[PDB]
Symmetry: D8
Subunit: 30 residues, 16 copies
């Protein structure tokens, strides 16, 4: 579905945001 | 349904955001 | 409902995020 | 309705996010 | 509307989050 | 419509979140 | 569309939030 | 569709949020 | 709700259609 | 919910349409 | 809203269907 | 689901309408 | 709106159906 | 999904309406 | 969009219903 | 899409109904 695929793109973008926060955790620990 | 499955994918991505913030908290605590 | 339950899963994930921010508040105070 | 009730649950979860950020602000102020 | 009012509750919660970030700005400046 | 008006209210609230983050950036710069 | 335009306003607000985070990155580097 | 296109715009904006957080992580690492 | 009231207007119109069919039943019997 | 209640009102109106058609069938049979 | 206005247009069209069926009933009665 | 069950009630009402048309077919044949 | 315009097309088609029933009323009277 | 399954149930009911009208046509032809 | 395109398909089908009723009116007139 | 395909199934069923009305026009003319 068109709308379902677009909603899945938001989840993929939020996963990108979660990965960036893991880098900040690596930055604080470093 | 694909719509509810896509909405569930956003919730799973937000959970990964919560996991990365817990890694940040441990990085500040250490 | 299928869609309603999926939306509730997002709220549960946001609650997880709020709990992680409370750990960061505990980390800054510590 | 279950849909509007589920949407209300997201708003309640975001309010808890605002509460945790106020705890962070007090942690920086102290 | 039921759904419209629930969506407005999310906006009110996000406004609460924005106010909490203003406290963090006051905390960093202090 | 009330639905689109409610969605517009979320966008206005997110804009206030962006404003508070700009206040944080100025607090770090000062 | 009325609803589509309101959803686009949320994306524009999130882009504003992303720009504010870039200022915080400039603040930390400075 | 304009609705799915608008939802895609939110995902693109969240991706820019992830990019700005990666810039923050590099600012802490440097 | 705006949308709910408009949907109720369709049901009222269908009830008008059902009443017209009752007149046709009266016309055939007469 | 008001939306599902409004959709239920359409189903009730269509049932009245079925009742009027049964009155027509009895008018032809008599 | 344009959506509720469009739904209202369907109800108005169904009302015209009820009007034409009342004209049929008068045609059988005469 | 609340909305899904209400939509199923419309299908059940349309099935009632189809059964009434079968009576009219029995009335014409009789 | 794309969806609103498509819904309006259904109302226009129902108006066409109502006009055809007026011809049947003219046919029975003739 | 339950929503699409419910919409499919309406289409199945409308098909039964078409079947009953074909029985009417055979009743007029005989 | 596929949703609005599907809604347009219903309007096209209802137009064919209006065409068949005009054929009925000509069958009664002849 | 799941929902779009289900909506298209309704249009196909309405086309079946329009074809049945053409048989009734053939029945009246015959």
């Amino acid at each position: 579905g068109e709308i379902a695929q677009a909603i899945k793109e938001i989840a993929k973008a939020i996963k990108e945001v979660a990965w960036a926060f893991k880098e900040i955790a690596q930055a604080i620990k470093g």
